[PDB]
């Protein structure tokens, strides 16, 4: 039994290029920007990481794209809290890319963001399956 939002059918096999939505292009940087800085204010030692799922991953989508991740926890415990979420078989493998590449899984997501964040403020992530449509 799917949760939210894998109860709702995506129809992949008719998605295209002109529909393809992500959350930098559905709300505006400036809305974006201030957001992030909000977050530095009210939850200083957090990290503010965008999750999104790869385009066509054969891999169910995930309800919150938004995490607060503490400031020491590792890649590799990333990993694991997203599998958790959109609750994969612990048979089916999950990755992570940053910048389209993966980053060590012991490495501190505090130093994925002073390496990679976004002019927004927000770190940003995609995660995928062994297959895509
Ligand atoms: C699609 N029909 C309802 C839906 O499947 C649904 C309802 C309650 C839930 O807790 C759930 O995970 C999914």
């Known amino acids: 039994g799917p949760e939210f ?16 939505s992500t959350f930098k292009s559905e709300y505006p940087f400036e809305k974006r920007k201030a957001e992030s800085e909000r977050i530095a204010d009210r939850f200083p030692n957090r990290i503010p990481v965008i999750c999104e799922k ?21 890649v590799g415990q ?6 958790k979420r959109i609750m994969l078989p612990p048979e089916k493998a ?22 990679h ?11 995928s399956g062994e297959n895509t449509f």
């Open 117 to 127: 964040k976004d002019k927004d403020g927000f770190l940003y992530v995609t995660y």
């Open 78 to 83: 990333f990993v694991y809290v997203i599998r």
């Open 5 to 20: 939002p894998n109860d709702y059918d995506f129809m992949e096999d008719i998605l295209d290029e002109t529909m393809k």
């Open 94 to 115: 999950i990755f992570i890319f940053v910048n389209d590449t993966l980053p060590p899984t012991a490495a501190l997501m505090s130093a994925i963001y002073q390496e």
């Open 54 to 74: 790869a385009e066509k991953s054969d891999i169910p989508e995930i309800d919150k794209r938004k995490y607060l991740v503490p400031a020491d926890l590792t």
